[model samples]
Target chain A: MSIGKLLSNGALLVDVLIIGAGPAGLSTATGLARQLHTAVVFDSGVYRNAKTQHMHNVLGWDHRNPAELRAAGRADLTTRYSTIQFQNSTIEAIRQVETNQLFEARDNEGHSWYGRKVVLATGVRDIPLDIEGYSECWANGIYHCLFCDGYEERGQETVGVLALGPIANPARALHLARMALRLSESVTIYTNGNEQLAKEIQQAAEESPVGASGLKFEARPIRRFEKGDVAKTVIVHLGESESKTEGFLVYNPQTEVNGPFAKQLALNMTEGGDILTTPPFYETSVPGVFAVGDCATPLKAVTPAVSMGSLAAGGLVAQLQAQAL
Target chain B: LLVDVLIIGAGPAGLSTATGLARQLHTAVVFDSGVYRNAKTQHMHNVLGWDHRNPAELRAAGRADLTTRYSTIQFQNSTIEAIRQVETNQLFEARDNEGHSWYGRKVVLATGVRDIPLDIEGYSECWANGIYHCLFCDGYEERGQETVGVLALGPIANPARALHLARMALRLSESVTIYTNGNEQLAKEIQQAAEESPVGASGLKFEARPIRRFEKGDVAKTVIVHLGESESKTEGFLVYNPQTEVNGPFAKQLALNMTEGGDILTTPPFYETSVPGVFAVGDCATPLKAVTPAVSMGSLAAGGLVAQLQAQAL
Candidate 1:
């Protein structure tokens, strides 16, 4: 764990304790430290999406790697702001101490710290998935968006989408048409067992796009995967028949909320486990407890997260004044 | 109650604009009703820089900046009771719940809309977290994270649902689903329209259900999302619930031109409401309430207000 200690034993109690040192927490700390003159952040470092390579749609820094962006942000913040300190501490528990509303936090190493206000920039977590080999191909070959990663695999011989519900039918039609001219005319849509899509959606998938032909839809559940001559092929059961297809995969993951010490502090949370907040500024449910980045809130782009952190810092400065009065 | 200007509502659109104006104008005040429109929400998505902040914190910062810069600006810790326009260009009487009244040359009506509480089950608890609004604001953060539910119905809801679906397609890896709330025909039409559009086109995948109670995850069961009769539930994350209001009492008192729902119609780029002396900005003016636009409008309003008042002196 990262260690950040007090300079003198008699120094006043900390003014702020920011949790989750991702873009949100770190940026908030930097901005707050500048405005409030005293602030710090404690991060577990486990709450970040380390796997994803690129984050698009973010202004000024679009198409850059998420990790690189985070690293640069952290380094710049630490250098620019002296009052903002970063400690790699995992919060074991958080409890409200007294009527004055002092918050006590115990880290994994058993270090205890008290602060006048706390910021839970503890970002949201993605839901877990229930599919074989699904995790392996994510951000690699299997992708959720044709816009983010679709360009990388454009014109590839085989492209595939998993048809679990009605949504997949239209997605398949669009992907097939987009790639028909570029990728191999060998586009296929696989219905992975669940087939409750509307009749019209099902019927529409049967028709192929003009110009480039040979797109196919197979109502078969994938049994296993095998490396094919062209790409990767998944063997499937087409009801009474058996078939295989070689292409890309787009499977949806089940999202769930995961964070530490937020619930214990009574920070507002969504029914879906996301940290509750108000928009355009990304303030959370509890006063002093601000959630930013991906944990919950809208507009998860890098640009928005950075702005939220800065704004949250400004908010913290305001809260500090109110407390003093 | 006493200052060069007393801006009501401390939300971001209100706060940022106020801060910018305060820095330049030299004297201004701001008041928060203490109740945020998205107070019960989770994560503020789509805002540039501060995407997912708690609403409370945002207000705190705005309050802090105002106090830190202009210490003399009064912050009345109460709600506005009534607003009286006098002398054609000045606010004649502005009363608070505390029976106090103050006057200023001009008043900025930053009061926004309130969510129309839905009768559906678990609707309140599910809002902001599992349930949401403003897809352009929230969809990207929810990307590949959860099954996004859009609570759109009828023709109006269809466009919003479709817009949300398109954004989700661009931002998220998760399957964008729509609960039409019994409006199947519109949903079907939207689905058809999306199909005929372009590749990577996001369309609302509809299911026939209103909604029922929400069972928290602690029960270890999927979140209970119900339809009309059988009362069923689905395990997913985030629902967007649209609101009916465009403006609140404060905007109406300013004699602003608004829709039936109270949303103010403003002059584009300038953010001036129908009333010449009073001004309206942000979410109260546009169906699109993302922070970028709101911030822009707020800044624009402040500039316009200053210029208009200055011109009157000439």
Candidate 2:
């Protein structure tokens, strides 16, 4: 909704330069616009939840497409604040100008932008499971976070959890199975041929009083997945001749933040690659740079993302005041 | 919401989690103490769909949505004074200000935070009137003023905080005077920052007079401060964030973990307090307090509590 001050070189100069167009980016723009500040959020348009059907655990936004919330926020922010604008855009390079103490960024179109502050709202991307058809079935027949997509499949006869990679360990696999168990009567821990992990999971389940009776283990290597005859269902082709039809499958994913914003700025990252940020204010290791959304923390959710994005903008404003003073 | 979850406050977080829980067919009751830290705040901002409106309007809307859509959620207009858990069943028993008590499978404390008013005279009356805590919420209304005040007291006495508040004030006014009551170091820091181009560019002023009381000014919505003797000047508005604590004794009684900032410390994603059957949300949980985060925390807290109870049940 807002147009930045175009410099002589056709560079857009703004109060802040924001990256990504997900909830965090848009929310930051909205927070800035509310304070009578200017921002043009450049989104690469790829979203972490593009495959997610409906976002849940967000008050008043339950069971709505994840896009629905972002769309609504965009409309409200853009309609109300002339200081906020969105572009289906991408920025490839960002460098801080030592002379002016501003951020200079080059977008995909070769157009440049300058800002006193820069916010990285670029979210995370799920590293697709190597299994065939896993990516396609993601959010459709497969789920990640139990809190977000778990309860919808309450009627599943036998929910499956792939215990591989990030989910290979007993504690992590059991964590998923326990929450999954609440959704269905039975949950299968698929070891993908890892008999050692399968037995360990069984042992852990038996050892804990949470020794869930509904939990079962399978060691057969999954060959591929085919669409279930039932709608919104998955069929795991296990071994050569064996197959297990599951209402859905849950897997803990190894997620990397969506963009190279961190490496470009030399910002500190937590283990597993979330940009390290201070609490209350999501300022990055670099003084003037802020990172938010899925890129910032492991507890990735829309509500936290929106809150962090907007609050980061607030912190940016204070930074402008303090430094500009 | 479980078979039933006892919510200690019906503000954004309390109400938000209630909505989330009800969608799961979980039963929840929101307890209204008839008090909110922002109850004095006339309007709230930055909340999608309900910006620049009475703080209570959105609360009414959330209440309406739950009343119409979620039959399982109930509202009780009373304060809960005490709560305990039956360790055997992992259930909670809560007694309200009223004589009646009730049982719940889980507990959520959205009891919010108590803003401790400074000893300044008329400070309570001036709150949200001439004294505004959050500029993003209230400052825009009276922007472009001539005189603004930033009280250097409580937490704002530090370098970063003082500079931030002064900067927030300077943006809205032609001049800003930081009232550093008896804190010479605070005044010295302000002077040091004022000597810099960033803060000095704005007409930043500071006074370290030891004695002062603030009074409602003769001008509409202005505050008058007496720094020394009878000298006084009216400010368009004052920027002062008071120290706050968890609203009640619930955190201590429940033995919940707390942040170094003296607020409830909750696990992220879902803000489950250290107590197994209990949770905390809203302003009481973190100093990064705002309506959006509060609502988000509330709703997410519900999901975590559900998982918690369900796992406990298994």
Candidate 3:
């Protein structure tokens, strides 16, 4: 079908419809566009690292703003690839039109779109800590990924780690504590009154070298966090009691698959709650549907996400060509 | 141990891997041989942020990123002569060209593929400047030209790839010619398929003759083909055919599982080779030789290596 005919039916049609405009979505579209295929990207303005000031470890674009990187990618796509379209909207609903063997997606703006293939680059969301003042300090004082933000706070006076239920398990909390120990003079693991997990935390801490000096295990039930103006003095409330800690930075490394699209589509998920994909291809259980980036793997970084996007587009291109035959 | 991970290349794959290893607080020692697969190309494309830039500049940027951010990463200019896995422990000992020894817990082989040069006169002099290989990399630059040549290594090597190259070249230019280099006869099936193709009806020609010599014009200006009694010159010609092989003394020594095409085989997601604590990435492990995929595989391999170290620590 021609582009004008596809858009005239009140539903925009393309060879591939990509969701999310982060590294994965942009990279995938670039690949498809280079192959002379049509693709439309729907971006909801939600990013996994939206609050991150600078992204590191990415080649050539190191220590640059994530938004700047994304802008450059979009500019390249529009200038070089006339077949690619970038829309600023969220895909509210998607369904496979079984009769035509195509996917139909409706955005939040009530516009309908169609594609032979759909890619999900919608990344995960960090489940915020329940403690008071936690949300306010996120990305500023409290962070999730150490690889991204650890260098800025290395060799501080004190750091705090909040362990909450199964989200931030004792093992994960211990790992974060060890990472924190490398950056801070003292590290504290606050279990928030989970007595059983606190015991496990204590046992693991004692065996590890992090427990040797400047490491403390606190089983106190956290009431709230008194957010200080600076990273130097953040107050932590211990039930009815409180302690003034210096050079405090909190690390919470818990996350859940973001957005309702995954649940709405009933896509198969791994035990870790990530979307399950076939190796090398990254195709989901459903045919013509694929996932990549943070939602697809636990290795949540820009480099891997960009790579997954390129590989997925390549696989999809091959599948599309084979189908054409 | 001298380091946690020993990276054996300084290309996009190895440098990206070193960046990840350093971020995870693991000391990675990277060895550079100053050789690259894309050394023939002046500019790189399809890399996310660094498009149309010098390939050497990208490598330098990656190395600088790793060293500036993480002090644990050390880069050296040396060729590794041999790698021996210690049986008593899982540690690997690597001997350099100068007889210096370095031990590491894990090894990453990002030593990229080496291209097998065509046995024709003046082929090497005009490789990247005039002659080209990949369509995706060089097609845009040479687009709209009237005539282009597809150099087929032989029917025994890859007949299907030659046909595909001819088809792609037809898309980029008005005329396309297939030069078989007199190695093998063109398959009848392929010729029949081309006859039915739109480009074949109007613009495709077949020439089965041995290339006696190449006439260089700073770039590829003409290819002189031997026509039994006389020599014919094809003008405005850009020859493109790339045949590569993975050749390293360590490949035989390590005995890693290899694919039919000679690429190292690695487990998915982790990119670990069959040998324990050894990982491979980039062109050596994948059929796709693009920089984007290579960078991605290198990053993923480093993440896997870090997790392995964490598991060992636990």
Candidate 4:
């Protein structure tokens, strides 16, 4: 209702500008609102966990729809905190205005939004592995974080891990395989045609008594993956060899902070592509710009994201307060 | 539940850790000293979707979620008096207040802190009511008031922190004061800094009279500071950082390293203390001890501990 109220020729100025309506963004807005700081949350209505049916490892929200939590957060703001406003649009350009020393944000809607401080809570983008039919079974038959979903498929016959990227390291392969052993009896490490990596993984697996018995390395080229007849099942189709089936697959997809805002703001990033920030507050190299949640740290989860949001709000408020003095 | 993870202190952090273990299908037996630190505050703020809700409601809901949804989580309202680890087996043994022993492969200490109030009358009753422990947790509730006050204690006893809180308190009201309860020397130091501060320190006020008591005013969200025979009314809430100490005795029993201010030293992100199998979260470990941070610490601790447990099971 008030979207057009803050509009003008130039940019609408606010105390804080938060992007993304995920846990981090909502939390930052809530925190700032409690501090009596006005903020506007810009959301594009997109999220990383869009495909997942239920989220786990969260307190009071175990095995519940992630959207329900987001809705409740938005509802709280609408009913209680009038200091916060919501804009249903994606930020196209974000930069600092030297003239007024305010952070300028232009959304896809051509409306300019400005804030004294900007919070990049846009979150991270999960780039699914390039494989035939892999997209179909991403969150359906392929679970990445074991802490989030492995217990549902516990006591299964076969477990699978795509041994590539970070998992290609021998020690990592061994560590992941043995951890997977707790959920199932057998685990297959699909190397995706990396024979050398397979040999290394096999050698490393032999070091663990349980891994020696349960872990096996598959170096054959992966043709595709299809959903199995049973629920939460995946069949790995090999190009040169007979296909194999597991209860479900496991692999950490390459993740990077979503959108061009990070680079546009000249933010420093970690080797893993997350926008690097100082610990606790999650402040980037830029003074007025703060990156939070999956966008800031490699340790991506709901609670940590929420945690970083509140912490950054505190830090931002302190800096703002200090400047006023 | 057969305790694979023994969580001491069933506050937000403990309950959150149990949720993580429950999702992993691992058993967590939680024990508490029956101490509720944040219980004095009726409503909690800035907890994401749970903004402005009852603090006990969050605790109760978190407890019910674990009990009804997952069979692997169990709660015991007994203080964990002592703890010892078997070096050979790498298992932890904890004895409760009733002298009952419980064994676990891993132990989590979510034992939160207790804020020691200043020596004064009616201060205890004003706690979590008229007087707030945190500036961020409160202040907004009393917005549009004429004036606010901050007590000189803990970190805020100094000039820097006192000015910081007073500066923050300005957003809520036009005027803010720093009450140096019984500290004449501290009042002078702050007054000296207030003059030299580059920030808007000119608008700030100071009250150096020794506080006899802090009692609730006739109006809601207001406190009357009784300075011996004299009294002053603070419309906005009173904010202070009292001497906070970790509640449970397990830290000493387990020989954990502690900071000067009685916080458990925990590895960054790892959340594990000096003892390998022992993990610390909540007010006991976090620098900014709050409910959301405590819950986040639980999630962080749960990941490492669960992975370790899975590897150990192999």
Candidate 3 residue lDDT tens string, A93-165: 8888742247888888898888888898888888777778777777877766666776666767788877774
CA lDDT of B41 in candidate 4? 74
Candidate RMSDs in Å, in order, are: 25.6, 3.5, 4.3, 2.5
* Chain B alone vs. reference chain B, TM-score for every model: 0.82, 0.94, 0.90, 0.91
Candidate with top TM-score is 4
The candidates, ranked best first by lDDT, are 4, 2, 3, 1
Q: Which candidate number has the best lDDT?
A: 4
Tens digit per residue, CA lDDT, model 4, B1-314: 23788999888998888888877778888997778887767778888888788888878888988888778888888888888886523688988879899989999999898888778888877787778767678767777867878887666899888887877788887888888877889988888887776565666788888787877887887888877476665546788878788877888988899987889989877699988889999998866788889999898898778767755642
Which 10 residues in a row give candidate 1 chain A its minimum summed lDDT?
A1-10
> What are the TM-scores, per candidate, against the unseen true structure?
0.47, 0.88, 0.84, 0.94
Choose 2 or 4, whichever is better by DockQ: 4
Per-model lDDT: 0.56, 0.80, 0.75, 0.82
Flag clash pairs in model 3.
A155-A183
lDDT of 1 at B237: 58
Say which prediction, candidate 1 or candidate 2, comes out ahead on DockQ: 2
lDDT of 4 by residue, A1-325 (tens): 3332243544456777898899999888878877777788999988989888788877777788999889999998878778788889989999887422478888887877778788999988788788888888888888878877877788889989888777777766776776677688899989998999898878766654434777778899999998888988899999766898898888888887888987798888899998889976888888888888888887889998999999998887877676631
Q: How displaced is residue A91 in candidate 2, in Å?
A: 1.2
Model 4 spans with C-alpha error above 4 angstroms: A1-12, A208-211, B192-195, B228-235
Candidate No. with top DockQ: 4
How far out, in Å, is residue B291 in model 2?
1.7
Q: List the residue pairs that clash in candidate 4.
A: A325-B198, A325-B199, A325-B200
Model 2 chain A is weakest, by summed lDDT over 10 consecutive residues, at A1-10
Taking the tens digit of each residue's C-alpha lDDT, what string does model 2 give over B182-232?
A: 889889887786676454635778878864688988776799887788888
Instruction: Compose the digit string of candidate 1's lDDT tens values, residues A1-325.
Output: 2223242443345767777777777666655543324555787777545677665433223345766756765665555435666778787787766533466777889887767667777766544345555555555555553423444344456666655532355644444333332334466666655455423334554453322245456655665443334433333324545655555555443344455665686667666566777753455655556666656653333434555666665556545533431
Please tell me which model should have the higher DockQ, number 1 or number 4: 4
